[PDB]
Amino acid sequence: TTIMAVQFDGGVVLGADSRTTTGSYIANRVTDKLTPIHDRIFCCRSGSAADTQAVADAVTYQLGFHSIELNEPPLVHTAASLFKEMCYRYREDLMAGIIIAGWDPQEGGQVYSVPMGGMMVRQSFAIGGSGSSYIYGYVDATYREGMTKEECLQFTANALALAMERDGSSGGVIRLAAIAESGVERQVLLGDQIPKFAVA
């Protein structure tokens, strides 16, 4: 579980692994952790599967209803606030850490990083989940400003590969999503395509 998101110029690039452990056994190994809240807004789920899934479904309900009432695409900040409310009122009963990220006409690509607890804060890049501890340093050292879509994708793939090789609760295939004005361009990095770093 190493969900990751970066804001580039004009949009956002998500990123997640696919591994749902129930202890040391791999219950599901091709999990899609990129639940689409809206047409151009995504969330990343970390923690207990049930809580995040239910929260994402409730939020997509509320946000679809809100978007219909306003007759406009919703702002990413609106979805972030909707996640914050549910994750904060029930902070004791939930174990969800969400990385809401998407694009809207007003503010461009946005990445909000609602952690376990109910915070809502904007980030130039946000990572979460169990394996994020092993790539904090890498993302701090390598992130720059003004990155294009392609090198953002490469950066995300590298960070996720570094995390999955180290953490046991993280592995499998890397699911990416490059949200922009035009639309989401999903891809899956599998087998050989995952960047490999020569072990000593």
Partner 1 sequence: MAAVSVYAPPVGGFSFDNCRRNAVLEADFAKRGYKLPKVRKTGTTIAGVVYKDGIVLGADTRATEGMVVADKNCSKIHFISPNIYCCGAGTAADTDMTTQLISSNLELHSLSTGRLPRVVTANRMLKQMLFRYQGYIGAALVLGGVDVTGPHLYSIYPHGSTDKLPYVTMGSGSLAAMAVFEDKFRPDMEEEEAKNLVSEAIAAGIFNDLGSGSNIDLCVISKNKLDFLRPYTVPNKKGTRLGRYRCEKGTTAVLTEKITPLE
Partner 2 sequence: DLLRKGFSCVKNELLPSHPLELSEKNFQLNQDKMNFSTLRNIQGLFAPLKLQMEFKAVQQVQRLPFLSSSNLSLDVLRGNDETIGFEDILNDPSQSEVMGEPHLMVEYKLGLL
Partner 3 sequence: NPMVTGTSVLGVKFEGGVVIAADMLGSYGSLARFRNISRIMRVNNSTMLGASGDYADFQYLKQVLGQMVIDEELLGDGHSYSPRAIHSWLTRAMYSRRSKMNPLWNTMVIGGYADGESFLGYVDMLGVAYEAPSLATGYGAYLAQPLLREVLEKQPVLSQTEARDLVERCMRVLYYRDARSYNRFQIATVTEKGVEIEGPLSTETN
Residues tagged active-site: 1
Smallest gap from Cβ 166 to a second copy, in A, equals 5
Task: Please list, residue by residue across 15-46, b when 16 or more beta carbons sit within 10 angstroms of its beta carbon and e when fewer do.
Answer: bbbbbbbeeeeeeeeebebbbbbbebbbbbbb
Cα dihedral 159, 160, 161, 164 sign: positive
Nearest to 18 by CA among 49, 58, 56: 49
Query: Residue 175 corresponds to which tokens in the numbers above?
Result: 């699911």
Query: 144 Cβ partners below 8 Å, 6+ apart?
Result: none
Smallest gap from Cβ 155 to a second copy, in A, equals 11
**What residue 62 binds from partner 1, partner 2, a second copy, none (CB within 5 to 8 A, per partner kind)?**
partner 2
**CB nearer a second copy, residue 69 or residue 144:** 144
**CB nearer partner 2, residue 65 or residue 136:** 65
What is the Cα–Cα distance from 21 to 33, expressed in whole angstroms? 13
Rule CB under 8 A: is residue 188 a binding residue for partner 1?
A: no
What is the Cα–Cα distance from 2 to 121, expressed in whole angstroms? 19
Smallest gap from Cβ 153 to partner 1, in A, equals 26
Angle, helices 76-89 vs 49-70, to 10°: value is: 140
Rule CB under 8 A: is residue 62 a binding residue for partner 2?
A: yes
Query: Residue 47 corresponds to which tokens in the numbers above?
Result: 């923690």
Give the per-residue contact string, 70-109, with partner 3 (x = CB under 8 A; - = no).
Answer: --------------x---x--x------------------
Contact residue for partner 2 among 69, 92, 140, 145 (CB under 8 A)? 69
Contact residue for partner 3 among 48, 53, 106, 133 (CB under 8 A)? 133
* Residues engaged in binding partner 1 (CB under 8 A): 20, 25, 27-28, 30-31, 48-51, 53-54
